Design a protein around this nucleic acid. Structure first.
Lengths: 366, 366
DNA sequence: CCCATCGTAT
DNA sequence: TTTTATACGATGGG
């Protein structure tokens, strides 16, 4: 195997395929990147057995086919540390890979490419294209609601559902839920899959915010996304995800609307004096007014009064303020709408000017 | 106690005094700030028992004398969380301090001002004024060479020494050492003291990049620094700091000069493949040339060659590349000078065009 | 004091 | 002012 490439055409791919790696590998080979030269292209792959990131680089200079694997971190840092515009010549020399540039020489240890994990081929059942911004919007709007290493394995991920001409993402940890839908102008078959949290993270990281479309393929047990010269593939979580349609409150007749930022700043300040663990805050809604109070074990107390739009019956309800703040932070709109039912029922939060995304959060006991 | 101040006139001071605190105090009250209203001045103090930071804020609005202590982080977060230009009214009421602004209200638990740690009165024995830039240079030039948690307490700090018309700083961990001297335009008595590691950090933090003079007072067991409306005081570390004069190599006859960045980048790359434990690299000096090599347990190997200015005899010496990089990273100059003696001797390093600072690194011999 | 993650400055 | 071939300060915890 042999190839010579410009430092900059290499740093981009290397950085991307290193994503799957997460330190302290269970297998030493999972700490390496697979390098493959064939038909004028250099392919680099990074994986953690659950997913893989593949980058392809065009070889415009003389090269020789072949493959090997080398320490990802070490190789990336070496390339990163050479001077801008540096020419990096690489060649396999037995049990080690030689890297040369200017007057710098580096010999790295290798592991047989043949031993590199290889996700078994599979077949896509649903395919579609969409702008990176749409995919970016969908994940950002719900990612924060995904569960974190929760015993209910089916919650440690994000649901990606196709329905009609829409792609929707759903995320929940049992206490709060987020859902967002975006039309992708294509009649799609109805399909639902759970993408593991690490996969959603990688997916988001492969979006360079450009105009290049995203090509997505979904199989019975896998999802693949192609953007530019990168191909990401992840296994799916085998389980049954909650139905957002049954999570949304049934009868939230009490509607409250208020400026998003003023509402967020009030909760942010009140949260300072809320229980550090439970983080509960009390809301008292009355005619065009909202009273937010917070108390902690120290018996400290925060109170915020703000003008809002509300014409329903007065009521008091408690909420974990972090859950509320996460929603307001994600919205990033002008005004938000809170839909309540009673003190023992969840609340639904949405952008006042958009029902594309919905947020549900369970109340806390007084 | 009562006062009303604009948010912006309070934010800066709060951050300054919340410096020694950090997170998780060892003693509860250390997590509180002392607030004192006397005359037309509000004083705010933060401490960690070893040092204290005091800020003075002129009170132009009506006030009432008094003092108390309140959770520093909570108070700062409340103030910071209020809208720009907010007026912050504060009043003490029993065991709680009431904070109000617009329609936001906060009640903080207090601890008696009489309980607040107060360094005993002490006498200054040496005093001088110096430009803030001189203190910044002295600290930045030597800070990295201080020990961190050495059993020899005095190495976990920085020696500040007055001699003739110079102020000098020395820092060493026993493996490497840094010394820097600056003229301060005033004849002073010969004096030496050791400032604790955390104190050095704070001296640094209190510099504002302006022309405000830095007034220093040194006593048998304390050092005080005054800049603008801020006064920092720290206890000193007892001990006999090592004499840098005796640490500088005696006969470092072989002198090599090279570009600081080129040398730094080569060392940085070579470092990637050095023992992650001992981080040793080997240097080979020959006529106008430097060869840096490194290998690790994985049998990987790196080699850098650089054109340098050198006429002495050839020699091979080992070093902890981290120590070498720390110096080069500090010496942000055009060219560096490395003064060698032999394979079992230390190397002296300095800016090729300046002797104001010198660095010594123990060799790594086989 | 050391370590990992981190919103986000750069 | 959307972004990485990025970096150091704030941060929750041992």
């Amino acid at each position: 195997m042999k190839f010579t490439v410009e430092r900059e055409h290499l740093l981009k791919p290397l950085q991307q395929v290193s994503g799957p790696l997460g330190g302290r590998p269970t297998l030493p080979i999972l700490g390496n990147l697979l390098l493959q030269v064939a038909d004028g292209t250099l392919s680099l792959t990074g994986t953690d057995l659950e997913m893989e990131m593949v980058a392809r680089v065009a070889l415009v200079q003389p090269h020789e086919p072949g493959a090997t694997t080398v320490p990802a971190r070490k190789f990336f840092d070496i390339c990163r540390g050479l001077p801008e515009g540096a020419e990096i010549a690489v060649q396999l020399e037995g049990e080690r890979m030689l890297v040369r540039s200017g007057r710098s020489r580096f010999s790295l240890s290798t592991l047989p490419a043949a031993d590199f994990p290889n996700l078994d081929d599979w077949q896509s059942e649903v395919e579609f294209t969409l702008p990176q911004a749409t995919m970016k919007r969908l994940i950002e709007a719900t990612q924060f609601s995904m569960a974190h290493q929760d015993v209910r394995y089916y919650l440690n991920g994000m649901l990606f559902e196709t329905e009609g001409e829409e792609l929707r993402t759903v995320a929940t940890d049992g206490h709060r839920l987020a859902v967002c839908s975006m039309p992708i102008g294509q009649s799609l078959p109805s399909h639902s899959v759970i993408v593991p949290r690490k996969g959603v993270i990688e997916l988001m990281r492969m979006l360079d915010g450009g105009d290049n479309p995203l090509r997505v393929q979904i199989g019975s047990n896998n999802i693949r996304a192609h953007v530019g010269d990168f191909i990401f593939t992840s296994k799916l979580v085998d389980g049954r995800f909650p139905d957002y349609r049954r999570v949304l409150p049934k009868n939230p007749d009490k509607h409250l609307e208020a400026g998003c930022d003023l509402l967020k700043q009030a909760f942010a300040r009140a949260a300072i004096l809320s229980n550090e663990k439970f983080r509960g805050v009390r809301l008292y809604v009355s005619e065009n007014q909202l009273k937010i109070t917070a108390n902690n074990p120290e018996q400290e107390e925060a109170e915020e009064i703000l003008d809002v739009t509300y014409s329903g019956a007065e009521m008091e309800i408690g909420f974990n303020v972090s859950y509320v703040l996460d929603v307001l932070n994600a919205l990033k709109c002008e005004n938000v709408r809170m839909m309540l039912t009673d003190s023992v029922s969840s609340v639904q939060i949405e952008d006042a000017a958009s029902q594309s995304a919905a947020y549900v959060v369970m109340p806390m006991r007084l």
